[PDB]
Design a protein around this ligand. Structure first.
Ligand SMILES: [Mg+2]
Ligand SMILES: [Mg+2]
Ligand SMILES: [Mg+2]
Ligand SMILES: [Mg+2]
Ligand SMILES: [Zn+2]
Ligand SMILES: [Zn+2]
Lengths: 641, 651
């Protein structure tokens, strides 16, 4: 009782004014905790939950076996209504959860923790003494002692395991969009307001692209979101690739990307997620950013939408076929194409304007107005009718950044990369090479030499489209082998140097995985590719020797000092090509790290989306072809990467 | 037949009651206290869950075949515990040490003899680390004892994380739990062999070839510091570890192209009040590297710990006369002038602690000599022990030398440590020769090094109003040695920053120099006029680029390029050691190697001693400083001692 070093007998005065109402949720013995509480002098009286009003300086303790018991939803309503602090304890099982001191209007309520646990659970006497210690610490932290000399479990879950004797701390996050403790529809007011971009001049861009803040600092700041109970990223494995390779490193994260209803297949395969690889020490930062973007892209019911059909919306709505861009021939052969195709290139049902769907507002930058995109195309896991699965949400254009403008730039670069890759791949076009020596980067030369030493010839091809945004594809194939195992990487940026860096990082993220490749475990779609990825059979994968190789001085410099001007110049670049750039703010207020989805209608993905006239017309416009290619004359193989 | 409350406790151990109950008739727990702590509460706590626990007198050695001895204490450095350890090792009886008092609980390890370290394996590292300045306990102790009992009994399931050789530190105030891995020490006086270093030193040193596998960045190193930290994290602890870390990355995270790490540990066993607490604390084992984002700061701490005298180090008590030519005179290593000894007191009132002048060596007195392996002669020489190890107890009237870090180095292999130490030695030699003669040297064009990092750093420094350049100060050994000089323009305080680098590969030597400059740079607000950098702040305040003309490159001689240095580095480090040895032999020098690595730590640490090589500090007794500039033709005539630079090297 004196280990709190607060007072020998003055602290008892606090115990003379504080009552602790102990209660059980589902069949827990309340008496032992009560007796433990009078053992140290705390006046504890049993409660059942019917009482709402409480005397000042009171704490309500509730015991449970699971943190998602429905009865808690009642208690969470009682506490918020009465503004009463309460503690949640799980004394049973091998793992003990001390739970947070739910203080209304200051810390998160129970609903925040329950929502995060649900989003995260898609996959004896010592408890009493620890609970007594935590309660006693809370008693003195509010009556006499100050904030600093009194650590408390307020808004903090302590997970203690006796079997391994290890203790972990999870930080409960107050969600401003929580239905119970906050504004339940903050997103619909945020989206309806016009989107405004604030200028933010960069300060340090020595390496890792044009970022105004260190991604390591971002991970350090957002480590409070890294938790398997009260967090959004499961962490767990963290780094996957060995740390010996300093030039290129990797790190893995666990999240949810696909929401298939097959439990058996989800049990082993769909669990965890991907996102791994960077030449800089920010591979873990990139994986964390991708996990954050995937978590922000999932549907949870708070998303802004309006139930209507295309007729009422008129010109304000973008037709789903204008974004998905599937050819009518693909639709009319949907069944057998889906039967022979993979999950990535699944062909959805044709969209009919007769039915009524939910449209999410988006900010059209080119017209500076509000358009409407089908919600199923924006958010993962959106429940669609079994007869109206007209589209499935993908990661194309979704991007992460500290500022919204940086996320917009990343998303637009992703869209441009996908368009250029599709145009080059499906036309089977030959494009000039790029000499890495002219790029003034010894890293490219040394990684090329390393790949050649490992019996893998590597080179880079320039596939820049009419947008004139420097984009490159790095291709590496194993020599003197029947299985070439062609590895591809794509990199697009205003700065050609970092575009080449992105391409080489993407191509060598798989290069070091050789000699023990995880094969069919998750590269099943890439298996048959390696059975046919031969340079002689794919002549477009080798550069056109006739045209001289492009150099670093062949590309104009377009990047500006401030990211706002980068967003602007991207807008005029898109406008000059007769395209409309739309931005959807996926940033969750409870997280704070900006996530944005950039949607451009006519821009296609690299999957079998043959309905886009860009693939047919852009090579003609640049003169790469004299006549547009017929749909059946294009490449019948999807892009493996 | 136990109470249902007891069988509930065994439930969380995933063991059926029938299997567990049987073990309860075969395990006897003798509970005892060393500081008169209440022993009964733990006995009754163990009896409640069914464990047959009885009190222990403290002297009985006869024990049943299956048993466990629990010892309660308030501190782990109680002298009486040493007796208990002697009982445990002699009787081969496992025992657990518990500290159930105070705010912070120490669960202590299960000291199993011949498998885990004994008590004093923990006690020595606690003593080194502590040179600065309750129902929960019972229940955790009961849980740990029961886990050990069930693990010892059947071991039906593989996962049994018992406390065997592992200390659990639990702080209830903020409720945090830490794990410290106790490490068995082969040189421990009681459980191990306390003579191990003596046989290791007397045996001839043999170097084995080991071809390098990865030389991506940082230099010719076997592995990145991250791998070393991952391998040796069991030494990172404030209880049973050699380095406390805690601070870890102290440099700002905004910088990306370079990083630095600082940790706090113990290097010198001091006793003066001005050195006991005020200055010894915040001792930074700095590690600066361009690669990575957090650095390590771990190798320096390891070498400093390995250089500390502990009494196990090999030594023979004799004098120079009977040792003969096999010994090396201390003045042949310290290299202090006789004129520097005659006015030792006057030069000791003024100046820093680093450049203190020791008393002249006396050949009549008897001292302890540590054997070292001379590679040039491939034999054993003898160096005074006080010159090799930190904190060696020297007589007040015969304090002839003080151990320094010159030549000490680390490595995953002994040969790599030897290379690093030799590079440090030649670096300091060349820097002293250049500095004390005030010689002007040709510049080095960074663009010729085909490294964009050099140009980026130079441009950043120029943007920050700090002009930076590089000067080649390579000595007669022809090992590329570079000094990077930075100074702030348009200011009355230039704050000249100097970095030193030396390697066979000129590119990584330049990289070392610029990294050394950058580690000190970007610390304008770091004022230490009186805390720890009084000499550095004095140098910043009273040294410009015009009053120190040698600091600027010589404009007359054209700047050296990257193609002006011959290539000597090889794929394997063994012939690198051999070529360093033959380079030293050609210059009429003897290379000596002392293996300071400890068997418990494992990481290789070596001190390379070359007698005639001077250091940064005021060591005017070496004829190399006087003669090498003449030999290379830099100076027509040797410089008189009073004509040299009267300012010590601040870096
Ligand atoms: Mg990605
Ligand atoms: Mg993306
Ligand atoms: Mg150093
Ligand atoms: Mg050193
Ligand atoms: Zn809430
Ligand atoms: Zn021992």
């Amino acid at each position: 009782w004196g280990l709190l070093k607060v007072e020998p007998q003055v602290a008892y005065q606090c115990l003379q004014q504080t009552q602790v109402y102990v209660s059980s949720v589902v069949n827990l013995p309340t008496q032992p905790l009560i007796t433990a509480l009078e053992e140290v002098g705390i006046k504890a009286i049993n409660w059942d939950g019917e009482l709402q009003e409480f005397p000042p300086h009171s704490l309500l303790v509730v015991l449970t076996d699971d943190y998602l018991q429905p009865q808690l939803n009642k208690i969470n309503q009682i506490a918020l209504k009465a503004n009463q602090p309460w503690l949640l304890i799980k004394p049973v099982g091998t793992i003990l959860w001390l739970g947070p001191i739910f203080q209304p209007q200051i810390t998160g309520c129970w609903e925040c923790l329950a929502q995060r646990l649900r989003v995260n659970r898609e996959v004896l006497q010592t408890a009493l003494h620890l609970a007594t210690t935590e309660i006693a610490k809370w008693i003195v932290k509010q009556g006499v002692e100050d904030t600093t000399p009194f650590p408390t479990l307020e808004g903090k879950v302590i997970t203690f395991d006796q079997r391994n004797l290890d203790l972990q701390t999870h930080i409960l996050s107050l969600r401003p969009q929580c239905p119970s403790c906050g504004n339940p529809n903050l997103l619909t007011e945020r989206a309806f307001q016009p989107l405004v971009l604030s200028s933010r001049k960069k300060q340090f861009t020595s390496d890792g692209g044009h970022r105004a803040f260190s991604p390591d600092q971002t991970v350090n700041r957002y480590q409070h979101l890294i938790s398997p109970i009260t967090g959004v990223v499961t962490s767990l494995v963290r780094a996957s690739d060995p740390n010996d390779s300093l030039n290129h490193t990797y790190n893995a994260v666990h999240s949810f990307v696909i929401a298939s209803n097959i439990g058996r297949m989800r049990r082993y395969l769909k669990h965890k997620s991907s996102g791994k690889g960077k030449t800089d020490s920010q591979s873990k930062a990139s994986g964390f950013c991708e996990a954050i973007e995937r978590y922000s892209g999932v549907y949870q019911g708070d998303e802004p939408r309006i139930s209507a059909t295309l007729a009422e919306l008129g010109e304000k709505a973008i037709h789903p076929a204008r974004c998905s861009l599937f050819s009518s021939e693909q639709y009319e052969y949907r069944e057998e194409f889906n039967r022979r195709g993979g999950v990535f290139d699944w062909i959805p049902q044709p969209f009919d304007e007769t039915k009524v769907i939910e449209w999410t507002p988006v900010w059209s930058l080119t017209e500076q107005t509000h358009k409407y995109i089908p919600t199923a195309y924006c958010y993962y896991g959106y429940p669609l009718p079994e007869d109206h699965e007209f589209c499935r949400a993908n990661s194309n254009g979704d991007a992460t950044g500290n500022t919204l403008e940086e996320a917009i730039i990343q998303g637009f670069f992703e869209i441009v990369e996908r368009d250029s890759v599709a145009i080059w791949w499906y036309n089977r076009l030959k494009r000039p090479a790029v000499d890495l020596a002219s790029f003034n980067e010894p890293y490219l030369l040394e990684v090329q030499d390393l790949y050649r030493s490992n019996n893998r010839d590597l080179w880079v091809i320039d596939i820049t489209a009419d947008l004139d945004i420097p984009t490159f594809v790095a291709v590496s194939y194993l020599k003197d082998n029947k299985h070439q195992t062609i590895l591809l990487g794509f990199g697009t940026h205003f700065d050609p140097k970092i575009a080449i860096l992105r391409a080489v990082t993407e191509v060598n993220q798989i290069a070091f995985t050789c000699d023990g490749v995880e094969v069919t475990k998750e590269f099943v779609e890439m298996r048959e590719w390696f059975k046919k990825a031969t340079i002689e059979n794919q002549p477009y994968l080798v550069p056109d020797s006739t045209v001289p190789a492009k150099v670093y001085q062949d590309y104009q410099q377009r990047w500006s000092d401030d990211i706002y001007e980068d967003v602007m110049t991207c807008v005029e670049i898109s406008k000059n090509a007769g395209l409309e750039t739309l931005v959807l703010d996926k940033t969750r207020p409870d997280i704070g790290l900006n996530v944005a989805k950039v949607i451009v209608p006519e821009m296609p993905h690299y999957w079998l989306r043959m309905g886009a006239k860009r693939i047919y017309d852009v090579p003609v416009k640049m003169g790469w072809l004299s006549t547009p290619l017929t749909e059946e004359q294009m490449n019948p193989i999807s892009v493996p990467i």
